[PDB]
Design a protein around this nucleic acid. Sequence first.
RNA 1: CGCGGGGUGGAGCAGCCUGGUAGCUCGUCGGGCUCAUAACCCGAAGGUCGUCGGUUCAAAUCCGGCCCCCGCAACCA
RNA 2: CGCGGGGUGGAGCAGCCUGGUAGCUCGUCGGGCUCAUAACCCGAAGGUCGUCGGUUCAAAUCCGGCCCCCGCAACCA
RNA 3: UCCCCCGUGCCCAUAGCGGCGUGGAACCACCCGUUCCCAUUCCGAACACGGAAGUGAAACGCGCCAGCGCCGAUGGUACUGGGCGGGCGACCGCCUGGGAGAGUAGGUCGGUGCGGGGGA
RNA 4: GGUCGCCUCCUAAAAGGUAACGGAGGCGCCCAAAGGUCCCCUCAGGCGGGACGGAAAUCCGCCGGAGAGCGCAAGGGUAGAAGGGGGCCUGACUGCGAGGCCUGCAAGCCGAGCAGGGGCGAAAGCCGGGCCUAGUGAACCGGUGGUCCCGUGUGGAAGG
RNA 5: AAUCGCAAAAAGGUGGGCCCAGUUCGGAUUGGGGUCUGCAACCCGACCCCAUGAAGCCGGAAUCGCUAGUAAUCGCGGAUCAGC
Lengths: 181, 117, 69
Amino acid sequence: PLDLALKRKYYEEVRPELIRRFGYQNVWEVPRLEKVVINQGLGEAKEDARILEKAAQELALITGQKPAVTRAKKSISNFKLRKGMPIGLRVTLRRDRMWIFLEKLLNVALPRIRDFRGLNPNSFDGRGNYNLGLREQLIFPEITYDMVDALRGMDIAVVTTAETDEEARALLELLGFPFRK
Amino acid sequence: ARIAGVEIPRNKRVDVALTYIYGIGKARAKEALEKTGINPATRVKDLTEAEVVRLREYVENTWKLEGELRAEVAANIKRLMDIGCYRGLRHRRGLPVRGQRTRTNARTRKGPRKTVA
Amino acid sequence: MKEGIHPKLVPARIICGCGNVIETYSTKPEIYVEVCSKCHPFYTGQQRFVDTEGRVERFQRRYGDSYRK
RNA sequence: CGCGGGGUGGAGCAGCCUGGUAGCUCGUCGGGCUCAUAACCCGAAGGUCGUCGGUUCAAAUCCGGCCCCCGCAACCA
RNA sequence: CGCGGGGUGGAGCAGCCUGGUAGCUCGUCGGGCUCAUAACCCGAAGGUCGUCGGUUCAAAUCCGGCCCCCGCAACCA
RNA sequence: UCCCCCGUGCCCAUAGCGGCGUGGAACCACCCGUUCCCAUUCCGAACACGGAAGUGAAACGCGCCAGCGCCGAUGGUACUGGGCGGGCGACCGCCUGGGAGAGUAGGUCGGUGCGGGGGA
RNA sequence: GGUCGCCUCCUAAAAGGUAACGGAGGCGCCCAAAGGUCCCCUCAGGCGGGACGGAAAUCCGCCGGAGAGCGCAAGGGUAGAAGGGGGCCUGACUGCGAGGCCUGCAAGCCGAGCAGGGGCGAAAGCCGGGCCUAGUGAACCGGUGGUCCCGUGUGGAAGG
RNA sequence: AAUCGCAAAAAGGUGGGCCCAGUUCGGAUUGGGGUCUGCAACCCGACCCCAUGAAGCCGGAAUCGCUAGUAAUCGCGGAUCAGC
Ligand SMILES: CN(CC[C@H](N)CC(=O)N[C@H]1C=C[C@H](n2ccc(N)nc2=O)O[C@@H]1C(=O)O)C(=N)N
Ligand SMILES: [Mg+2]
Ligand SMILES: [Mg+2]
Ligand SMILES: [Mg+2]
Ligand SMILES: [Mg+2]
Ligand SMILES: [Mg+2]
Ligand SMILES: [Mg+2]
Ligand SMILES: [Mg+2]
Ligand SMILES: [Mg+2]
Ligand SMILES: [Mg+2]
Ligand SMILES: [Mg+2]
Ligand SMILES: [Mg+2]
Ligand SMILES: [Mg+2]
Ligand SMILES: [Mg+2]
Ligand SMILES: [Mg+2]
Ligand SMILES: [Mg+2]
Ligand SMILES: [Mg+2]
Ligand SMILES: [Mg+2]
Ligand SMILES: [Mg+2]
Ligand SMILES: [Mg+2]
Ligand SMILES: [Mg+2]
Ligand SMILES: [Mg+2]
Ligand SMILES: [Mg+2]
Ligand SMILES: [Mg+2]
Ligand SMILES: [Mg+2]
Ligand SMILES: [Mg+2]
Ligand SMILES: [Mg+2]
Ligand SMILES: [Mg+2]
Ligand SMILES: [Mg+2]
Ligand SMILES: [Mg+2]
Ligand SMILES: [Mg+2]
Ligand SMILES: [Mg+2]
Ligand SMILES: [Mg+2]
Ligand SMILES: [Mg+2]
Ligand SMILES: [Mg+2]
Ligand SMILES: [Mg+2]
Ligand SMILES: [Mg+2]
Ligand SMILES: [Mg+2]
Ligand SMILES: [Mg+2]
Ligand SMILES: [Mg+2]
Ligand SMILES: [Mg+2]
Ligand SMILES: [Mg+2]
Ligand SMILES: [Mg+2]
Ligand SMILES: [Mg+2]
Ligand SMILES: [Mg+2]
Ligand SMILES: [Mg+2]
Ligand SMILES: [Mg+2]
Ligand SMILES: [Mg+2]
Ligand SMILES: [Mg+2]
Ligand SMILES: [Mg+2]
Ligand SMILES: [Mg+2]
Ligand SMILES: [Mg+2]
Ligand SMILES: [Mg+2]
Ligand SMILES: [Mg+2]
Ligand SMILES: [Mg+2]
Ligand SMILES: [Mg+2]
Ligand SMILES: [Mg+2]
Ligand SMILES: [Mg+2]
Ligand SMILES: [Mg+2]
Ligand SMILES: [Mg+2]
Ligand SMILES: [Mg+2]
Ligand SMILES: [Mg+2]
Ligand SMILES: [Mg+2]
Ligand SMILES: [Mg+2]
Ligand SMILES: [Zn+2]
């Protein structure tokens, strides 16, 4: 709905340096970010933690959306889990909550991670787009020591029109992402 | 979460709360009271909201800490392996590398007394 | 939008860095930092920190070449 | 082969019925007392449970094939 | 199904015909003693007194009975 | 009546998998937005709605190839209803009628009926 | 010794049916949601992808027609749902039943449609329990609740 | 060498600071960086600086010394010896 600092960043700076490399013969063939699916993917909320909520409202006040409880695919023995047990926290940041979130990761949250050292670049899938994992949560700007209780890393997935892995590299690299080498 | 790798203790002194970082002691804490002139020892929260920030900077780029210093002390010993030295072979074993006495004690190198028949 | 349950994030000033209030509408009214997108090893600069070229290893200890060929 | 019961730390026994649940005794290794050994006092160590499939979310436990311990039979008029 | 009684600390039970105390040995910790495993001994954590709804001035001893174990009885086309 | 298009029926993959192309004035789609109706175990993704700036990239459409899948004969045979003889047997032979499965040659990148909206 | 009723499959010779102390398995339950409807949705698996996190917890990607699932045995069927989720619900109706399936009898089984009165749906329509095929017991004797039909001259009652 | 030297005796007195926490208790362990001896410091020393900041919240069964300036608790000192 809105207009923000990375949304225009992707606008007049990124679209050209992309037609730079691959020289797209059409307005749309050019990459662009669609979905952003954050995944705390608990399982720490087994047959116990009803307090999975005070860890997922934190997920709300850092993503802006309520996260939807993903349950069990089936029942699992050594994992201590029954088909139906809550074990996931999926929030799909789509459209203009994506840019509002993605910039706040890159400019403020990404650097505040302890001993930052690039981004693992092989972790690109190939057939399409990209995603890679965390370690914590309070590194995110919205919180600190007393507000955050238990520690909880989280997964984060990009879904772009990057048909090819190479052109994905460029899209994110230019968009503000620091890589390992 | 605070400074500079992880959050130093609020409600704690601005001479004491120093050593807690992976890289500082009461020895190096004198940079505070003497190389930026900081409070005698009045608390971390107690500090002036701009004096708080002036301390953030002057010890990050002045020394080495946390993840680098952990690795600095760590990656250094990998060298000792790749040559095959008496200090890098006894670390390769996890035994008192700094050469002492390994009959009685030598526990901290060894873990709990394993005990055997 | 589902009406209610989502935190009403109004445009909030992210007062970070050394001269950048990285504005974008966060649900947290104001923010701070001590390590940011500004000052950073991989964000710009060589970043020697205070770690030079591997402490001193090994011929940088000087007091060498006692022998004169 | 016919039925019946059994197989679990080294020895001997619980545990199965009602699945997720491994205990009792001895002994064994470590330590104490003692001149010393036992006694006794202080600690710990030790079984994927016959064997295989398999049911279930998952098997000492439920199920079936085979190996084995033991108990009655295989009536020969 | 119908008559008999309670379902009390973790494991047993006296409180109880006549309500007043949020009950005693075993078990368990610490303690004096023991050479010890022991009896003795001083202090202790344990009741939502099966629950629910009552009778009052509160109930665990008085009720409607939920409950579902022990007990007896009789019937089973 | 010929053609393209949209909405659709029908034969049952010769239709399909894939790669190669081309189609936007039309019509279809993506696309614009969240105000309204409506809407998400989160998200206007989807369903919804108000639109018409962009486009034919995606999807879909018409087409091209035969790598895949698919369909696939003729000939002969196995088998067999019926009628005979043959071997100790396990089984074998002849007559008459019927006659496959595989495999071979080859075919296939669809074929159409109803209405509507364009072209002449 | 084993067996005895029921269901699945095979034997069973391409209709139905068919024996043997033939070969293999299950049933004597379950579900106020696992049911009715309306809306909506789509598997197993494999490869790459990713903090804890795994051969397999959850999130992302491309390939998948059905090998998943459908309470539990097996066969048939089945995603153009019969399977997964949500809203309202209670047709897991009362009175019937044209016509058949099976069949020695008796039982078993399918059901359009009509009437009352409701459920969901905008409506067309769908609901007389569950993807079907097991989850069972004739008659006698009695219990309980109703109805108020008989009630030993007669009004009741007893009994039925 | 009752000259001068090792020599500030430490517990103590006095001011301050902590604030019931594996902590300012605790100093094990370790990485690089230095001084001193002695040819010499890998095995192998001792001191020094940075940093690291471990077991330990008082000890199972058992067990030891000591009856008065003694137990307990403090520092100093020689001999061995280049150093330790
Ligand atoms: C030992 N007896 C004999 C009973 C008879 N009247 C006589 C006799 O010999 N009967 C026997 C006849 C054969 C019978 N038998 C044996 C084997 C077999 N396979 N089938 C049989 O019938 O078993 C009988 C048996 O011994 O009791 C008695 N105590 N009565
Ligand atoms: Mg190009
Ligand atoms: Mg790193
Ligand atoms: Mg050097
Ligand atoms: Mg047996
Ligand atoms: Mg044995
Ligand atoms: Mg026993
Ligand atoms: Mg068994
Ligand atoms: Mg067990
Ligand atoms: Mg004792
Ligand atoms: Mg067995
Ligand atoms: Mg015999
Ligand atoms: Mg009694
Ligand atoms: Mg009274
Ligand atoms: Mg003694
Ligand atoms: Mg009797
Ligand atoms: Mg009875
Ligand atoms: Mg159509
Ligand atoms: Mg094209
Ligand atoms: Mg145009
Ligand atoms: Mg193209
Ligand atoms: Mg296509
Ligand atoms: Mg055409
Ligand atoms: Mg045509
Ligand atoms: Mg044509
Ligand atoms: Mg054509
Ligand atoms: Mg050709
Ligand atoms: Mg061809
Ligand atoms: Mg060809
Ligand atoms: Mg063929
Ligand atoms: Mg014949
Ligand atoms: Mg013949
Ligand atoms: Mg023929
Ligand atoms: Mg013939
Ligand atoms: Mg025309
Ligand atoms: Mg015209
Ligand atoms: Mg018999
Ligand atoms: Mg017939
Ligand atoms: Mg028969
Ligand atoms: Mg594979
Ligand atoms: Mg993987
Ligand atoms: Mg990973
Ligand atoms: Mg990994
Ligand atoms: Mg995985
Ligand atoms: Mg099944
Ligand atoms: Mg079959
Ligand atoms: Mg089949
Ligand atoms: Mg449904
Ligand atoms: Mg459901
Ligand atoms: Mg409605
Ligand atoms: Mg009839
Ligand atoms: Mg009839
Ligand atoms: Mg009907
Ligand atoms: Mg109707
Ligand atoms: Mg059924
Ligand atoms: Mg009666
Ligand atoms: Mg009458
Ligand atoms: Mg009268
Ligand atoms: Mg009557
Ligand atoms: Mg003081
Ligand atoms: Mg204390
Ligand atoms: Mg501890
Ligand atoms: Mg003891
Ligand atoms: Mg003592
Ligand atoms: Zn900045």
